[PDB]
Structures are given as structure tokens and as C-alpha cells.
Amino acid sequence: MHRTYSLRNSRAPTASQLQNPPPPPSTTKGRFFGKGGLAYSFRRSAAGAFGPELSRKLSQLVKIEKNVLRSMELTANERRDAAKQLSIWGLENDDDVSDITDKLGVLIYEVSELDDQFIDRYDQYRLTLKSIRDIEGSVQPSRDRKDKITDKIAYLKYKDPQSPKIEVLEQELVRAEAESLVAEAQLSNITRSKLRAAFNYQFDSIIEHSEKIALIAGYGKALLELLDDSPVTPGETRPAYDGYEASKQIIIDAESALNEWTLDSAQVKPT
Amino acid sequence: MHRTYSLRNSRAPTASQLQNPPPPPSTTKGRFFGKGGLAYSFRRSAAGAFGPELSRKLSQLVKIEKNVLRSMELTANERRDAAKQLSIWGLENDDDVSDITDKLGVLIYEVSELDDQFIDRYDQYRLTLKSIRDIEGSVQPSRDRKDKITDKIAYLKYKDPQSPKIEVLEQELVRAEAESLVAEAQLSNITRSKLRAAFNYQFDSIIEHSEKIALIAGYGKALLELLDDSPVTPGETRPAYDGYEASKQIIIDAESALNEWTLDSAQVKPT
């Protein structure tokens, strides 16, 4: 949607893009459907199946959100595995390198834990959407019966103008219309309420998790200053790294700001 | 319809019935359908067949009238045969008896000739009814097409409210309605005209033929006075019959009144 007014689907570069040019496209693009294969697309296909034809789209969205959740669960546990592997690799290295890589590993572990909490809040969002899907599916048969009744009464009117069955189904249809009006009014109310609440909670969760992980990334950037990037000539060895206390103080302050973080202290501000 | 207010289909006796009691029912009632058999009922059955379903009753009436005409033709020629046979029988009898029976035979021949003329006028009536039947049969397909078109447009309205075919058939049906209104107006006019003219002519024909045959019967009753009903004793013979001139004068006067008869000289008068 950010594409410029040209013939190319090229997004307009932001100030960050001008500051640092965008990198080349990733080489990880594999020759695959990109939906987890037929095994993971079985759920997607089953979403588009014999349903109430009304919550079909909503049920499909819910099951797609379940796929989202499964993928995020896959990238959280295996990311914390990556952090563990990074610490294991940094075990046998320079003392400053080992300390700094262990601190980066623990920061990534914090990242994975926040991802898991975001996953739980995502499941709350998905459960609210499941509730709205189920109430919509329960309210659909009312309108289905309404459509069937109006079609049958139209056919009966075609057959003759004085069948008692005609008047009886008209009398039942005036009841069905009122019940369907009430059902659709409450359906609109519940859909609006669930939609607003679920998406407000979802956006609050994502902004909280994202600003928290950004607060973590800033602390990690500050921590990365401890190691010295000055190259050392072959032969003599550089002085030993004694910044253990500084790194521990940095991680302590990061923990303190992490625990102190609250919705009131949301330094992110729109304009 | 002349039956009294009782539980029996016994007609109220008129003054003639009081004057002379009614005779016993005829013994000529045969064990038969009374419609000329299946050969003569084939036409009646074919009248009730694949027709325009409107002139079906009128065509059936016309063919029944044809059966009427055939039966009347059968009883006219064979009645004149009966008159010839009566003259042949009276050939060998008393002179007065022979003369009087020959005069009765010629009166019956006049009766048969008047019957034949009545048959021709009956055929005029039947031809007028054939004309009205044929115009009604020609006007029926208009209303048949109207009914078919309205049924089809009702079904098309059931299917959807915006088919172009719907509006096109509505535009053709508003034309068909006007043409059917004109057709039914002219149909009513022609039916009334043909009905009134044909039945007025039929009733004039029947009253003319009937009053003429009654005028004949009165002359025959006057003529029957010539013969003597006084019994003669065995032995001597009664004086010879010389009333030939009187009988010839009676028949001459009957011929004169027959030729002089006109619609103006219709001595029959209703009240």
C-alpha cells in the first residue's frame, strides 16, 4: 500500500531508507507454497467446507490465526534454542566476548519469554474471535430459515391465492421476521463489542510487547559498548576485561526498568 | 318443469287433460340407449374431444342439432312413404272410404312437405349456430395465449424482479389485454346478434309451420265429416257416395288458404 505513484510495486522509501539503503532480498525464499505444505493447508481447506456459509470467512480467519499462533510458537521456542546455542558457542572465546555473548543470549531469552506472553494474549484474541464466530454461526440458521420460508410462501402464492397453508406460513413468517430483527440487532451489538474489545486488547498487547522489546534492544545496544573493537596486533595480548561489574549493573538496570514498566509509563507517543 | 308441488314428476293436468284423460304411456319404448346406437353416438363423442375447450359445448350442440335434423329427415320421407302406403291400402275399399283416405294421404303429403321446409329452415338455424361456434373457436386462442403469458410472467417474476424478458412480456401482455378486450367485445356483440336473429327466425319458422299444419288438420277434420259413420245392416247396400264435388271443393279451399297464408294473416295470438 506504501507503493509510489508509478507502475512498480515499490514502496516509497522512508527517512530510514535514505539514511541506510535497503538490503537485497532474502535468499531464504524456497520453492514451496509457503503455507506449511498440504498438512498445514488441510485446516485451511477444511475451513472452506460445509459450514453455515456465514461464519465460513470468520472460521477461516480463526483457523488462519491458529496457523499464525503455531508459527509464532515455532519461532519462539526455537529462537530460545538459538540463544542457548549462542551461549554455548561463546563458552570458548575471549572473556569479554564470552560475557557479552552470554548477556545477548539472556536478552534473547527475555525476547522469547515476551514472545510467549504475546502468544498467550494472541490466544485471548483468537478465543474472542472464536466466540464471535460461534454466535454468528448460531444466528445464521435464523436467516436461513427465513429465506427458505419466504421462497416456499412465494411458490405457494404462485400455486393459488387462498391455501390455508399460505396464511399459516405468513403468520409464522411475521414471527420469524421479528425474531430475526432481534437476532440481527443483538448480532450487530455483540460483533461490534467483541471486535472493539478484542482488537483494542490485541493492539495494547502488541504495543506493550513491542515497546518492551525495543526497550530491551536499546539496553542491548548500550551494553554492546563494553567490548573494544580496536584491533590488536599479533603477538602481545590486550589488557584483560574487567567490565563485569558494568555489565551486571546494565542488566540490573534493565531488569529494574522491565519490572517498573507499566501502561502509564508508555513513552511511545503518537501524533 | 310443469310438475306439481309434490314428490312425483307428474305434470299438472291442463284443461285438455281434464276434458280427455291422458292415454297410457307408449309401448314402443325399446331396450336401447335412445341415441341411435354407437354409430350415431360417435359424432356426439367426437364433439367432446380435442377442441378449443370453449366452443366444445357449442360444437356439441351443433352436432346434436345435426342429429335432430337427421332424425327429422328420417321421419319426413318415411312419413310420406306411410301416406303413400295408406293410399295404396285404401285403393281397394269403399268409394267414400277410398276418396277420404286418398285425401288424408294427400294432406299427410302436405305435412311431409312442410316438414321438409321446416328442415331447411332448421338447417339455416344450424348454419347460423355453426358460424357463431366458429367465431367463438377462433376467438378462444386469444384468451388461451393471454392465460399462458400471464402464467409465464408470474413464474418469471418469481424467479427474479429485473429480467428484461419480464418487462418485454409485460409490454406484449398489455397489447394482448387490449386485443382480447376488443375480441371479447366483438365476440359478445356477434354472439348476441347471431343468437337473437337465429332463434327469432327459428321461432318464426316453427310457428309458421305449426300453425300451417294446424290449419291443415282443421280442414282435414272438416273433411272427415263427409263419410257416414252410421252402421249398415247386413244385406242391402247403402246409397252410393256422391260427395266427390264437396271433397274437391274442400281441398280447393284448403289450397287457397294455404297459398293465401302469410305472416300478417297469423290468426294465432298470444296474451
UniProtKB/Swiss-Prot annotation, chains A, B:
GO biological process: one example: protein localization
Name under which the protein is recorded: Sphingolipid long chain base-responsive protein PIL1
Record has Ubl conjugation as a keyword: yes
Annotated crosslink Glycyl lysine isopeptide (Lys-Gly) (interchain with G-Cter in ubiquitin) location: K29
Alphabetic keyword roster: Isopeptide bond, Lipid droplet, Phosphoprotein, Ubl conjugation
Phosphothreonine: modified positions: T14, T233
Predominant subcellular localization, coarse grouping: other
Miscellaneous notes: Present with 2157 molecules/cell in log phase SD medium.
Keyword Repeat set for record: no
Residue spans of biased composition, Polar residues class: 1-19
GO cellular component, as recorded: cell periphery; cytoplasm; eisosome; eisosome filament; lipid droplet; mitochondrial outer membrane; mitochondrion; plasma membrane
Residue span relative to the full protein: 1 to 271 of 339
Modified residues (Phosphoserine): S16, S45, S98, S163, S230
GO molecular function: lipid binding
Free-text function comment from the UniProt entry: Negative regulator of cell wall integrity (CWI) in unstressed cells, probably by inhibiting protein kinase PKH1/PHK2 activity and regulating their downstream CWI pathways PKC1-MAP kinase pathway and protein kinase YPK1 pathway. Activity may be regulated by the transient increase of sphingolipid long chain bases (LCBs) during heat stress.
Intracellular or extracellular location(s): Lipid droplet
Origin species: Saccharomyces cerevisiae (strain ATCC 204508 / S288c) (Baker's yeast)
Region Disordered, residue ranges: 1-31
PTM annotation, UniProt: Phosphorylated by PKH1 and PKH2. Phosphorylation is inhibited by sphingolipid long chain bases (LCBs).
